[PDB]
Amino acid sequence: TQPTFGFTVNWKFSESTTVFTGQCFIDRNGKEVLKTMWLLRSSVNDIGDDWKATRVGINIFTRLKCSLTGKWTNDLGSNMTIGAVNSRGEFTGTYITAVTATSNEIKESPLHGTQNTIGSTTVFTGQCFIDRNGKEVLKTMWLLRSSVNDIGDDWKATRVGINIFTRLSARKCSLTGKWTNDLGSNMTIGAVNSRGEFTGTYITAVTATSNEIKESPLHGTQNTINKRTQPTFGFTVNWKFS
Amino acid sequence: TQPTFGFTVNWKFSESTTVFTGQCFIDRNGKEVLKTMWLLRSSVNDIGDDWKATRVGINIFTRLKCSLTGKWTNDLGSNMTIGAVNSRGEFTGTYITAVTATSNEIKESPLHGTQNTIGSTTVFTGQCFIDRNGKEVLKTMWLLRSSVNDIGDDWKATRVGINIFTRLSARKCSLTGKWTNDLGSNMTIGAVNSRGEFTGTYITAVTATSNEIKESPLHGTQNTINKRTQPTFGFTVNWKFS
Ligand SMILES: O=C(O)CCCC[C@@H]1SC[C@@H]2NC(=O)N[C@@H]21
Numbered sequence: 198t199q200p201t202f203g204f205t206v207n208w209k210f211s212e213s214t215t216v217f218t219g220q221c222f223i224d225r226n227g228k229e230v231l232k233t234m235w236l237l238r239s240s241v242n243d244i245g246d247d248w249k250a251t252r253v254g255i256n257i258f259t260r261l262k263c264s265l266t267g268k269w270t271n272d273l274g275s276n277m278t279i280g281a282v283n284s285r286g287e288f289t290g291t292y293i294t295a296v297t298a299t300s301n302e303i304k305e306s307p308l309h310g311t312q313n314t315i316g317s318t319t320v321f322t323g324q325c326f327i328d329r330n331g332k333e334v335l336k337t338m339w340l341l342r343s344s345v346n347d348i349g350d351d352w353k354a355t356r357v358g359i360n361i362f363t364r365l366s367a368r369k370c371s372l373t374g375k376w377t378n379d380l381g382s383n384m385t386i387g388a389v390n391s392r393g394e395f396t397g398t399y400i401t402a403v404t405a406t407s408n409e410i411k412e413s414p415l416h417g418t419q420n421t422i423n424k425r426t427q428p429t430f431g432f433t434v435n436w437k438f439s
Numbered sequence: 440t441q442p443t444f445g446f447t448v449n450w451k452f453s454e455s456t457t458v459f460t461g462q463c464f465i466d467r468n469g470k471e472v473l474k475t476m477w478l479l480r481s482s483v484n485d486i487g488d489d490w491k492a493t494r495v496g497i498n499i500f501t502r503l504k505c506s507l508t509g510k511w512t513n514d515l516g517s518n519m520t521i522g523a524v525n526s527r528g529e530f531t532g533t534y535i536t537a538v539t540a541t542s543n544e545i546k547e548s549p550l551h552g553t554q555n556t557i558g559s560t561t562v563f564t565g566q567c568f569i570d571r572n573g574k575e576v577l578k579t580m581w582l583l584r585s586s587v588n589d590i591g592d593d594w595k596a597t598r599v600g601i602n603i604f605t606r607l608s609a610r611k612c613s614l615t616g617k618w619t620n621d622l623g624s625n626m627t628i629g630a631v632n633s634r635g636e637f638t639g640t641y642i643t644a645v646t647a648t649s650n651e652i653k654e655s656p657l658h659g660t661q662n663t664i665n666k667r668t669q670p671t672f673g674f675t676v677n678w679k680f681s
């Protein structure tokens with residue numbers, strides 16, 4: 198049972214973010230395959246258009262325990278490079294998409310993700326809006342990837358839903374702070390560095406497994422193309438004891 | 440435990456299809472609420488663009504056992520009317536969306552769906568392509584809605600994934616025939632009438648419950664706006680013994 202992972206692609210040629218989540222399998226004749234689902238979050242101008250901002254699909258990655266480190270290609274012809282995976286399961290890499298949903302010239306983009314140390318993964322993606330009352334809101338969608346024991350159960354490993362987060366001059370919408378969502382969960386996000394990267398912790402008020410879930414770490418980025426006041430973002434929660 | 444349902448909205452002002460799936464709850468002070476997730480399938484010109492054709496989100500419907508019959512409004516301001524639900528759980532209705540992803544003037548559109556008689560529901564949406572070799576392929580995405588026992592578990596009730604179907608002069612892509620997908624499942628679809636409606640049966644090769652699933656009925660529509668050779672479509676599988 199190779200672990201689950203998620204990652205965020207911080208696109209450098211548009212204001213969008215993609216999150217990918219899934220699981221590596223050593224099935225076919227010793228070959229490794231990443232089975233993933235993604236959410237592509239587009240930047241919208243107002244919260245009223247939020248409902249149409251999120252696309253969904255799959256990618257199967259093959260090479261160019263089931264190490265993520267290395268170079269991979271997917272079914273759409275995209276390539277990604279993933280470097281060393283640290284002890285906390287953290288990894289960074291670069292992605293070159295072969296295809297785009299926006300009318301911009303493609304640029305190689307960074308990715309940051311985490312693999313489940315020893316278990317499930319959730320990736321969230323959305324946009325940080327300043328509401329009419331000046332409060333920040335995160336409107337997000339997520340994919341919750343469960344571990345399966347054979348590739349034949351991969352089809353049923355991914356749940357989807359939404360979360361709205363609110364914080365516990367309102368010029369730029371910033372991810373830093375302590376947040377609660379509509380399910381009762383809480384997260385804290387640290388400073389967002391110049392590369393748009395941020396770290397935090399997450400305590401979910403709800404579970405889909407019968408394990409004890411502890412406070413779990415999160416790593417993500419915020420998109421900085423055209424330096425928007427309402428940036429898209431993505432993050433991966435690496436569930437602990439899950 | 441109010442049952443699960445799914446339905447297909449056959450849009451009349453664009454070449455798209457939306458499927459909705461979810462569950463009615465009598466929570467708040469006797470009030471009924473439909474918790475649903477949807478996939479919006481856009482029409483693309485070639486199979487190479489299929490990957491970006493599908494959007495995802497939620498809607499909560501409230502009124503304008505948990506009967507679907509009646510008039511409902513959702514959180515985006517859309518209205519739908521659902522008429523009588525028959526003994527097989529089949530229903531039809533009309534939908535007026537308040538919002539659009541295409542640059543066309545909005546028109547009231549038919550919907551056709553099914554509620555689970557006594558259990559889960561799957562909705563599929565996709566596009567019927569003629570491949571380069573002239574074979575038909577259905578590229579689809581689905582949401583599998585499970586029944587939960589309280590609204591508090593609604594967040595975890597929906598799985599997402601894909602299926603590719605192939606058939607067991609190639610001018611127009613037609614849904615009629617016997618199909619298999621990449622999981623081993625089989626479906627048969629009857630004639631597609633002038634309104635784009637069709638009926639069929641589905642035998643899944645795989646399950647996410649520990650019940651015995653029998654052959655289960657399906658009802659859907661194909662989109663006929665600009666009479667495309669590669670129409671989008673949606674259908675609901677009303678799982679039996681599930
Ligand atoms: O269009 C954009 O806004 C950015 C590029 C999005 C590329 C998507 S991510 C999901 C899918 N998988 C890929 O390898 N490329 C596309």
Ligand SMILES: O=C(O)CCCC[C@@H]1SC[C@@H]2NC(=O)N[C@@H]21
Nearest residue numbers: 317319382401404405406436439
């Ligand atoms: O069940 C697991 O495997 C780990 C916990 C999953 C919690 C999910 S992630 C999406 C949703 N939003 C939350 O704040 N919690 C749940």
Ligand SMILES: O=C(O)CCCC[C@@H]1SC[C@@H]2NC(=O)N[C@@H]21
Nearest residue numbers: 450453455457517536539540541
């Ligand atoms: O833009 C289109 O192609 C057709 C209209 C789509 C309307 C979508 S369906 C999901 C969401 N819920 C609604 O009530 N309206 C939008």
Ligand SMILES: O=C(O)CCCC[C@@H]1SC[C@@H]2NC(=O)N[C@@H]21
Nearest residue numbers: 559561624643646647648678681
């Ligand atoms: O598990 C259930 O509750 C009923 C069966 C679900 C079968 C799913 S639907 C999507 C996927 N595609 C298939 O052909 N079968 C599975």
